[PDB]
Design a protein that fits this description.
This is part of a larger assembly, with chains A (38 residues), B (169 residues), C (154 residues), D (175 residues), E (74 residues) and F (741 residues).
Chain A: H1 3-6, H2 10-30
Chain C: H1 9-24, H2 34-51, E1 57-58, E2 64-65, H3 79-103, H4 109-114, H5 118-127, H6 132-139
Antiparallel strand pairs in C: 1-2
Helix pairs in contact in C: 1-2, 3-5
Chain D: H1 35-58, H2 79-82, H3 88-102, H4 104-112, H5 134-159, H6 168-172
Helix pairs in contact in D: 1-5
The chains are: A mainly alpha (38), B mainly alpha (169), C mainly alpha (154), D mainly alpha (175), E mainly alpha (74), F mainly alpha (741).
Bound molecules: chlorophyll A (7 copies), 1,2-dipalmitoyl-phosphatidyl-glycerole (LHG), ligand ZEX, beta-carotene (BCR) and phylloquinone.
1,2-dipalmitoyl-phosphatidyl-glycerole (LHG) binds next to loops of chain F.
């Protein structure tokens, strides 16, 4: 019940989100490596 | 509906398409009416999209394409051919008139009891009855098998329609 | 002088140098080694890496330079990721502004920035997509800016 | 004591389906809150019954088209004949649906204490699917005991390898 | 190579003198009643926008030199 | 008396208080009206002696937090055994250790960073280990990957026992204070149970695992014909061939015919010239000596049976006349406050870690450890820096005891506060010793610097010039040359080859060479005496002036982390007992930076390197110390400039990550300085001038954006000065010696 309220705090959301955008960049740089165009 | 007592979320049972199913409680925190309108709109545009993957037969090839039943880089074929930007313009010219508030969670246009805009119904034999209840399933099945077409283009890659008779890997 | 990059000679010398120099590590392993397969995929990631720079401008160094004039012959270098990037941080800036002008009027605004209302947070996270004509329609409404806020002496 | 054992009279349990008694000799139900352990017991017993019927039913010799088994363990031939078909990946992935989709909030019903932590509904039976008092408890004890004997009996069905290296049918053809 | 570096370090010293005596002017020498809503009093009015935008361009160049040198160096 | 009194079901284990950040402090659960609430959320997160004065609740919190620390350590060691199992070339390294460079971590193939995968042999590449785990495992006798997977699995199992342990000891069985202040039993079980049975059972491992296995590897057998360690205990016939003393069983042990165990256990010393490490016969015999000697040592504390001491009747009997009261009071000091115990245990733990560093360069205890020099280097270096920081924590937590938990009633005329009665005479003579050693440790370098710069090299302090041959170190070093025949009578070789006989060459690589100490090494030792006395000056000034200085006569009222008092007294910035710890961290970086720069350059000139035929000698720098350590141009040229050549030219190669951890660690170093020099009275209204630019656009943050506080704003300057400055030397060291060793 209050566990999601812990998962709504500043650092936990910042790691579940920057982990996600970091995953967007790392998974988007294995699939499309050396992207200097566009 | 879902048997292990996990079913009193933020949702409502009289909502159309209801069969009592939110295990991961996405109805919490995500504006159940907006999730409903996203389900309806995803079902209708996936419905038309798998209707394109149904009417990929020889009919209606008017002078521009000449590439029958490709389903993969046909998207790239009309990125190359142009006028795919233009259909974003036309759809934009629809979505000025359709929703009229057009912002995703900020200021959802909830006025007319149903996620359906302006009453696009020129035939108008049914109104917003329990036909709504049988629209959503005809979207939901139109979602999943739509994926089942494109994944048939992904790893099978053979043909959309030519899995059904006796054709198995 | 900005030569077109596909025919610069010293550029192709960097091709020979990195393929062959990376191939000097390939002279250690057998044909079925996973390391050797990784250097097969790596040599693929060098020839593709250099053939996909065919429309840049590598000058006298053989190193692909850029252009930031918006010449429209080099718009794919800078101005297209410029518009793309300003869209992404106009998204982020608009989401942050809309979320703060939500939680400025709540019960406990101090608690709202520690513990994000993931309901209303992931409301605005997505809802800030059409921020050019949402900031342009809030700016005409006299709501984007402010007036008579805090200041020091004079 | 309440246990039919040495001594620990009703440490925390005593009304659970132990028809022969509540066993509990070691301090787990001392501090583990017992609902977690009950969901784990029932889930392990279901999957172990599936395991032992898997081993026996495969040892009755059935393949669509594969190699000779000679075993239902020892990963390359059996298991990585199946993985290199690209085949077990989905039979893991649908269970990766099942546990995260209908087992995780089910486990949240095993958080609050409002479940009777087995109970994924699921009685497709007429004349014998009693959800009430008698047959639910005395049949849930049947799932429980046959699942426990499935756990140990699957333990022996794994561990007959060193002096055997053969099938368990071939173990029945040996003494 | 010594004359250039000489006049550049002396150049920076004398700019920093110009601003240091700028702050001495605004403390021990400034009268905003003879400078009633003057150009100087206007400067002290919008000094918040001045410092916010200097901090903006300095932040932008500091993420776009150091970003590109650490990019090129990685 | 002694008994176990434990509260059960103390704290509920709900997630409810996770939703209240800052639940723990009643001074902090107000909610953030400023951003300084954020950072004070973390600096007060382990002020366990500042949540509530009730020592029971504090002591439950800490003793349960220890299991969290051991949980992270078992996750870490299980990580090392699994990275040794799955990812490493350890099975390939075990074939030929002198050729294959050790590597575990195999970098994921994304853009470029696959070039960090160094082709270290073993048919598999990856970034090279310098932690020396493989040398610990060959000494352990780990043969194939299965024991690394199993020991990693047991590492996770012990990590689960520590998580469930600390959970079990804060919440649903947590002890009373009467359990905690049972210190005769705590020593009585750590001296005997932890350390005693640890060394005894480890002697069991070394005798029944490592001695047969590292006899078979000393013979050169590949790890396939080696049987399991396991398979040596099922029958003695696999060990009676290796050591015939196993045939007699334990009968010569219980008949005290311990001459018969000369095969298993001996006193040789030196180094095994095949493996380059210690003789594991000596090491197993050694752990039996710690075993019997610590198990004897445990039983000096009376607990229940009226047999043994108490600490009280020991300390009260040392009532010497120059102290007057004697140690009357310290058993009430050290059994009520935890910061005092943390000061002692951190001081002795850190100094033990330095002792660990020295005893690992000069007596390399693992096989093939001194043949791969980076693992030889960095295991010296790393145990220096935790060997350093843990001393400053002493100077922290001896200060905190003087601020928080000091009490003049219990502490009246004893050995403690009679120091504080003459703390001016303490700090004044530390002050004199610091200036005397500074002149006579660094003025010699300015002197030889000028005399070499003025051309008059006859007037230097070189070998050829005015010599300053360290008389005492050469003399007692010669006593250690004359050890194994004269005084260590039953020895065979010396205590080390850093003292005595000819060097040890293992695979054309120099294990240990007799270190000569002449007239440059002298002056570096007076550096070390100097920069040890300065940190002792700051960290005794931070404890004796922790509470009531003659400048500020109430620091106990102000606290420990107060920044200052104000501009009065002409300014009292940076005056607290915390601030001396702030300075002791910089001088820690100094003192250990020149300890390791003394190490990594004298042992590239006088020990390490390779050998050729006919016993010829070739160091890495080639004897370039005693002619060049005497100046600073020789120091900065010949070491910090010349040894950079294998760090700076590392781009395009596999060392290039160090070339990234060399530049960026300069960055962070200089990025520290912004926090050190400036202050929050600038940054606060620079920030508030930016808060104007947010109030204009209604992007005003609800948590009000203050600048950092003063003690934070300097603490972050230390914590970047040390990460930046330490990681420069880290990447410089490992980028230097991997390119050679
Ligand atoms: C949270 C960020 C994130 C996101 C958005 C994705 C997204 C994706 N991953 Mg992925 N991944 C992530 C983190 C993430 N991953 C992490 C942290 C790991 C390490 C465990 C992996 C390991 C991983 C593997 C091993 C694979 C993917 C694959 C994929 C793609 C499946 C379609 C998709 C783009 C698959 C793919 O398409 O690659 C071929 C695939 O095989 N991912
Ligand atoms: C702040 C300055 C700065 C800038 C402008 C860039 C810009 C770039 N870097 Mg980069 N870099 C920087 C700092 C910077 N870097 C620093 C400081 C480091 C050290 C950590 C690196 C390390 C680094 C590496 C290791 C690599 C780059 C690469 C790149 C290029 C492609 C980025 C990418 O992954 O695209 C792919 C990402 C996307 C397509 C995501 C955008 C999609 C959006 C989010 C979806 C939504 C759209 C609406 C791009 C030119 C890559 C390259 O090939 O170099 C040319 C590359 O491999 N950079
Ligand atoms: C077969 C699927 C199906 C069904 C049952 C419905 C049903 C409904 N839609 Mg609908 N819709 C669909 C597909 C479907 N839709 C698709 C694909 C789109 C995208 C173009 C839309 C777009 C749409 C809008 C924009 C609106 C509706 C609305 C409605 C409701 C009242 C209108 C009506 O009389 O429809 C009755 C529909 C049928 C009896 C289905 C007949 C099926 C024909 C014969 C298929 C012909 C296909 C042919 C080969 C080409 C009703 C519940 C309105 C609403 O929500 O009310 C406010 C509304 O405003 N729909
Ligand atoms: C709520 C999001 C938000 C928005 C819209 C802005 C907007 C602005 N900031 Mg900024 N800022 C933010 C957060 C934000 N800031 C945070 C969190 C910090 C602390 C790191 C700063 C620190 C900061 C400084 C120091 C300065 C600005 C300045 C500015 C202005 C110039 C644009 C610029 O360079 O940005 C600057 C951007 C950064 C420094 C980094 C980006 C900030 C974060 C990481 C991105 C936003 C994500 C945010 C956390 C999302 C929260 C909402 C979400 C959880 C729902 C502009 C009005 C400058 C100014 O006054 O110019 C007029 C200036 O000098 N900002
Ligand atoms: C290496 C040394 C160093 C660096 C990098 C800086 C950098 C900066 N100083 Mg500065 N300063 C320094 C030394 C340094 N200083 C010293 C010695 C002094 C004398 C005390 C000052 C005095 C000073 C003043 C008086 C002022 C500054 C200001 C600034 C900022 C200028 C705006 C800008 O370029 O933003 C660009 C930002 C950067 C260059 C930051 C670096 C980017 C980082 C490393 C990336 C983010 C973190 C990264 C992801 C790593 C994560 C860490 C990990 C633990 C997770 C910038 C942060 C001014 C300011 O606030 O401007 C707005 C200002 O008024 N400085
Ligand atoms: C002979 C028995 C014994 C042993 C082996 C230990 C061992 C230890 N104690 Mg300990 N202790 C003991 C008796 C013992 N204690 C008694 C009798 C008291 C009361 C006076 C205490 C009070 C005490 C305190 C207050 C603290 C410790 C701490 C520690 C740990 C130090 C960290 C370390 O060395 O890491 C090396 C780690 C290991 C060698 C792992 C050893 C773990 C195995 C499983 C042995 C543990 C035995 C355990 C006591 C059995 C519990 C019995 C229970 C089931 C009935 C270490 C695990 C400190 C700590 O970190 O807390 C955990 C700490 O703060 N002890
Ligand atoms: C390179 C920079 C530098 C230097 C030289 C010093 C030097 C010193 N610090 Mg120090 N310090 C420094 C940086 C430096 N610090 C930094 C960065 C910090 C930040 C944390 C500190 C923090 C610090 C603390 C906290 C303390 C010191 C103390 C001391 C003194 C120790 C006693 C000693 O060595 O006397 C010998 C002097 C020298 C070695 C300096 C060179 C003098 C030469 C050898 C002889 C004189 C030259 C010449 C003949 C002069 C006459 C000619 C001229 C008049 C024309 C010493 C003067 C301690 C102190 O004040 O009292 C002991 C003390 O408590 N320092
Ligand atoms: C260590 C030798 C120190 C002589 C102390 C003599 C000593 O321990 O006498 C013992 C004397 C304490 O006399 P009591 O009889 O009171 O001692 C019994 C009690 O102390 C214990 O209950 O200690 C002091 O008076 C310390 C005086 C400081 C003396 C200043 C010198 C200490 C700093 C110098 C360090 C020199 C290292 C030199 C290495 C060569
Ligand atoms: C129940 C559920 C479903 C059913 C789901 C499944 C199909 C139910 C079936 C469950 C079976 C799998 C239960 C398994 C029980 C345990 C097995 C039988 C173990 C047997 C081992 C015994 C024989 C001992 C074996 C010694 C093991 C030892 C190692 C030596 O080698 C010797 C040897 C072989 C004697 C429906 C759909 C059918 C109906 C629904 O209403 C609900
Ligand atoms: C190229 C060219 C050109 C251009 C140029 C220009 C013109 C430029 C501009 C620029 C400039 C010309 C600028 C200026 C600069 C200056 C400065 C540098 C200033 C600043 C100031 C100072 C530094 C100080 C300040 C102050 C204060 C603070 C206070 C009081 C006031 C005062 C002002 C004193 C021309 C046109 C000629 C022509 C052609 C060529
Ligand atoms: C720069 C500086 C500051 C300013 C430092 C600012 C206030 C902190 C900047 C770092 C914070 C953490 C940035 C906040 C970003 C948030 C984490 C949210 C961003 C989103 C993601 C990164 C999560 C001081 O407050 C200070 C105080 C005393 C002496 C010197 C100094 C000093 O030199």
């Amino acid at each position: 019940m209050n566990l999601k309220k812990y998962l709504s705090t500043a650092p936990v959301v910042a790691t579940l989100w920057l982990f996600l955008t970091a995953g967007i960049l790392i998974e988007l740089n294995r699939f499309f490596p050396d992207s200097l165009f566009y | 509906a879902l048997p292990f007592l996990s079913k009193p979320p933020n949702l409502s049972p009289d909502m159309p398409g209801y069969r009592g199913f939110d295990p991961l409680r996405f109805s919490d925190a995500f504006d159940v009416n907006w999730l409903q309108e996203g389900e309806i709109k995803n079902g209708r545009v996936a419905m038309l999209a798998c209707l394109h993957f149904f009417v990929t037969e020889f009919y209606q090839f008017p002078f521009f394409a000449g590439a029958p039943k490709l389903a993969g880089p046909a998207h790239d074929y009309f990125v190359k051919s142009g006028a795919m930007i233009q259909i974003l313009a036309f759809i934009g010219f629809l979505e000025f008139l359709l929703h009229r508030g057009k912002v995703l969670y900020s200021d959802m246009e909830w006025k007319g009891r149903k996620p359906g805009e302006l009453g696009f119904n020129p035939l108008n034999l049914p109104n917003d009855k329990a036909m709504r209840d049988r629209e959503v399933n005809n979207g939901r099945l139109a979602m999943l098998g739509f994926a089942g077409i494109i994944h048939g283009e992904f790893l099978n890659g053979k043909m959309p329609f030519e899995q059904i008779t006796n054709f198995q890997p | 002088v900005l030569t077109p990059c596909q025919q610069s000679e010293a550029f192709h010398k960097r091709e020979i140098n990195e393929v062959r120099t990376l191939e000097n590590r390939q002279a250690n392993y057998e044909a079925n080694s996973p390391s050797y397969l990784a250097l097969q995929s790596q040599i693929d990631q060098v020839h593709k890496r250099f053939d996909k720079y065919g429309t840049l401008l590598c000058g006298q160094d053989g190193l692909p330079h850029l252009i930031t004039d918006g010449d429209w012959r080099h718009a794919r270098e800078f101005t297209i990721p410029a518009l793309l990037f300003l869209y992404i941080t106009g998204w982020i800036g608009w989401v942050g502004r809309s979320y703060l002008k939500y939680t400025k009027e709540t019960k406990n605004p101090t608690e709202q920035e520690i513990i994000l209302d993931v309901p209303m947070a992931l409301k605005y996270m997505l809802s800030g997509f059409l921020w050019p004509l949402s900031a342009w329609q809030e700016y005409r409404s006299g709501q984007l800016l402010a007036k008579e806020d805090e200041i020091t002496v004079s | 004591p309440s246990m039919p054992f040495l001594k620990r009279p009703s440490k925390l349990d005593g009304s659970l389906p132990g028809g022969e008694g509540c066993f509990d000799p070691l301090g787990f139900t001392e501090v583990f809150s017992l609902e977690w352990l009950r969901e784990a017991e029932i889930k392990h017993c279901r999957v172990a019954m599936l395991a032992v019927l898997g081993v026996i039913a495969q040892e009755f010799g059935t393949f669509d088209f594969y190699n000779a088994k000679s075993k239902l363990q020892l990963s390359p031939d059996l298991h990585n004949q199946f993985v290199q078909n690209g085949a077990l990946q989905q039979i893991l992935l649908f269970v990766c649906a099942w546990e995260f989709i209908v087992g995780l909030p089910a486990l949240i019903e095993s958080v609050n204490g409002n479940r009777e932590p087995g109970y994924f509904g699921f009685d497709p039976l007429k004349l014998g699917g009693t959800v009430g008092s008698a047959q639910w408890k005395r049949m849930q004890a049947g799932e429980l005991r046959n699942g426990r004997l499935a756990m140990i009996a699957f333990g022996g069905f794994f561990h007959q390898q060193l002096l055997t290296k053969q099938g368990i049918i071939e173990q029945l053809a040996h003494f | 190579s010594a004359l250039y570096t000489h006049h550049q370090y002396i150049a920076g010293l004398l700019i920093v003198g110009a601003f240091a005596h700028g702050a001495i002017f605004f403390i021990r020498d400034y009268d905003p009643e003879q400078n009633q809503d003057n150009v100087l009093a206007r400067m002290l009015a919008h000094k918040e926008a001045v410092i916010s935008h200097l901090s903006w361009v300095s932040l932008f160049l500091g993420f776009h030199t150091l970003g590109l040198y650490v990019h090129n160096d990685v | 008396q002694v008994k176990v009194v434990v509260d059960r079901d103390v704290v509920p284990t709900s997630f409810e208080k996770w939703a209240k950040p800052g639940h723990f402090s009643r001074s902090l659960a107000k909610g953030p009206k400023t951003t300084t609430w954020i950072w004070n959320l973390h600096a007060d997160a382990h002020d366990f002696d500042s949540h509530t004065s009730s020592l029971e609740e504090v002591s439950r919190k800490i003793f349960s937090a220890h299991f969290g620390q051991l949980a992270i350590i078992f996750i870490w060691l299980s990580g090392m055994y699994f990275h040794g199992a799955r990812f490493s070339n350890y099975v390939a390294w075990l074939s030929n250790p002198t050729g294959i460079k050790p590597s575990a971590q195999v970098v994921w193939p994304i853009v470029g960073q696959q070039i960090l995968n160094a082709d270290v042999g073993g048919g598999m590449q990856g970034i090279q280990i310098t932690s020396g785990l493989f040398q610990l495992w060959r000494a352990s006798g780990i043969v194939n990957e299965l024991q690394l997977y199993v020991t990693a699995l047991g590492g996770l199992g012990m990590a689960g026992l520590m998580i469930f342990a600390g959970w079990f000891h804060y919440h649903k069985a947590a002890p009373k204070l009467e359990w905690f202040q049972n210190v005769e039993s705590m020593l009585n079980h750590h001296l005997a149970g932890l350390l005693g049975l640890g060394s005894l059972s480890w002697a069991g491992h070394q005798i029944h695992v490592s001695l047969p296995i590292n006899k078979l590897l000393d013979a050169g057998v590949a790890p396939s014909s080696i049987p399991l360690p396991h398979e040596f205990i099922l029958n003695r016939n696999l060990m009676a061939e290796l050591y015939p003393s196993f045939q007699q069983g334990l009968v010569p042990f219980f008949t005290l015919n311990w001459k018969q165990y000369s095969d298993i256990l001996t006193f040789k010393g030196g180094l095994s010239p095949v493996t380059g490490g210690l003789w594991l016969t000596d090491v197993a015999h050694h752990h039996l000596a710690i075993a019997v000697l610590f198990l004897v040592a445990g039983h000096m504390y009376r607990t229940n049976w009226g047999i043994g001491h108490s600490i009280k009747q020991i300390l009260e009997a040392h009532k010497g006349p120059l102290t007057g009261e004697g140690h009357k009071g310290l058993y009430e000091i050290l059994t009520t406050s935890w910061h005092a115990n943390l000061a002692i245990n951190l001081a002795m733990l850190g100094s033990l870690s330095i002792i660990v560093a020295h005893h690992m360069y000069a007596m390399p205890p693992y096989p093939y450890l001194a043949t791969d020099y980076p693992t030889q280097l960095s295991l010296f270096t790393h145990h220096m820096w935790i060997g350093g920081f843990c001393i400053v924590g002493a100077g922290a937590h001896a200060a905190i005891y003087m601020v928080r938990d000091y009490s003049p009633t219990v502490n009246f005329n004893n050995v403690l506060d009679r120091m504080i009665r003459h703390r001016d005479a303490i700090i004044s003579h530390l002050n004199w010793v610091c200036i005397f050693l500074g002149m006579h440790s660094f003025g010699l370098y300015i002197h030889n610097d000028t005399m070499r710069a003025l051309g008059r090299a006859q007037d230097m302090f070189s070998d050829t010039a005015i010599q300053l041959q360290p008389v005492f170190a050469q003399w007692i070093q010669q006593i250690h040359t004359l050890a194994p025949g004269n005084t260590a009578v039953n020895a065979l070789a010396t205590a080390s080859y850093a003292f005595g006989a000819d060097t040890v060459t293992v695979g054309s690589k120099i294990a240990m060479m007799p270190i000569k100490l002449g007239t440059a090494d002298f002056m570096v030792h007076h550096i070390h005496a100097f920069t040890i006395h300065v940190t002792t000056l700051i960290l005794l000034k931070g404890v004796l002036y922790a509470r009531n200085s003659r400048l500020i006569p109430d620091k106990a009222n102000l606290g420990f982390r107060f920044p200052c008092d104000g501009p009065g007294r002409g300014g009292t910035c940076q005056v607290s007992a915390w601030d001396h710890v702030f300075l002791g961290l910089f001088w820690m970086y100094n003192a250990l930076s020149i300890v390791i720069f003394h190490f990594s350059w004298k042992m590239q000139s006088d020990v390490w390197g390779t050998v050729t035929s006919n016993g010829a000698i070739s160091h890495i720098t080639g004897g370039n110390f005693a002619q060049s350590a005497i100046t600073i141009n020789g120091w900065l040229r010949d070491f910090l400039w010349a040894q950079a050549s294998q760090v700076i030219q590392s781009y395009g190669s596999s060392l290039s990550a160090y070339g990234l951890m060399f530049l960026g660690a300069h960055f962070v170093w200089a990025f520290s300085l912004m926090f050190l020099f400036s202050g929050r009275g600038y940054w606060q209204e620079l920030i508030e001038s930016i808060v104007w630019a947010h109030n204009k656009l209604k992007v005003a943050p609800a948590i009000a954006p203050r600048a950092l506080s003063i003690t934070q704003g300097r603490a972050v300057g230390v914590a970047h000065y040390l990460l930046g400055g330490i990681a420069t030397t880290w990447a410089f060291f490992l980028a230097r010696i991997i390119a050679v060793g």
